[PDB]
Design a protein around this ligand. Sequence first.
Ligand SMILES: C[C@@H]1O[C@@H](Oc2c(-c3ccc(O)c(O)c3)oc3cc(O)cc(O)c3c2=O)[C@H](O)[C@H](O)[C@H]1O
Lengths: 282, 10
Amino acid sequence: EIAITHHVKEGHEKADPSQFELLKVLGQGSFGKVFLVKKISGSDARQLYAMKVLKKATLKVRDRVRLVEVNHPFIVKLHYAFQTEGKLYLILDFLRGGDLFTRLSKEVMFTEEDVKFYLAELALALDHLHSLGIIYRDLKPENILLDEEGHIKLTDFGLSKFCGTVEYMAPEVVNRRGHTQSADWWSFGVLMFEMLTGTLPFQGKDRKETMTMILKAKLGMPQFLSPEAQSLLRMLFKRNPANRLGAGPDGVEEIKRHSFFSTIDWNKLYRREIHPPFKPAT
Amino acid sequence: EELEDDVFQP
Ligand SMILES: C[C@@H]1O[C@@H](Oc2c(-c3ccc(O)c(O)c3)oc3cc(O)cc(O)c3c2=O)[C@H](O)[C@H](O)[C@H]1O
């Protein structure tokens, strides 16, 4: 089954099926049957929202560690999530022409230039969520979508099939001894390894072997990677969170300054003025 | 922890 971890706001109230009304039901391809709905009550009243009605899904509601609400360019958000009549209702941002990053990953290979773009946008998104009080623990390519123009859309909610995907979990999470937002920047590195190498840095036949690798393995640096990418992976794949890039006070700035992202104008990127490497069909 | 902070080999 699917496990949706909803990082709700403090004070944000639950929703009911009657509180929204259906305008169109469409197929967003891999998003499946998406119901387009508009709210009747609250601040969001009159807002179009995608609705997914899932039958085999478990809702965990983790509050944010922690005012002005804002739409980040590279994040889609779960606004409401209610289990009614044995069905899980998810009210999310409408992502017209959206697709899965896992689709592109299988069909085409990315240059390091391609990985820079998507990872740069993902880092902005991840830091925005960290600034919102959300620690991901299990950030994974399944949590990464793409909009109609090709820009990254990170889910602000967890998606797992604490059920998470061990392969993307930092040592301190795996240890079940404590973690901070720095655990997510390790996973960022795991993503980078898989994007750039096509394989996972830590993978065994079972979760115990995969866990052991995370905790104890010594990895050969793929030498086809650029020196900048090698350095970033070396600095993000540090088992002591205090020695990890992105664990200091400036957070993502430690990563945004790394030589690998030296070609990114992070201001242009946020303004969606850097054009994505692959453009979805339209 | 008490683990090899560096994961990639030297
Ligand atoms: C909760 C997900 O809903 C549907 O896909 C959507 C996803 C999605 C997300 C991550 C994935 O790994 C993935 O396979 C799909 O994301 C959405 C985000 C939105 O803002 C609005 C949506 O309607 C979907 C949206 O409809 C699909 O039915 C998917 O199988 C299911 O897991």
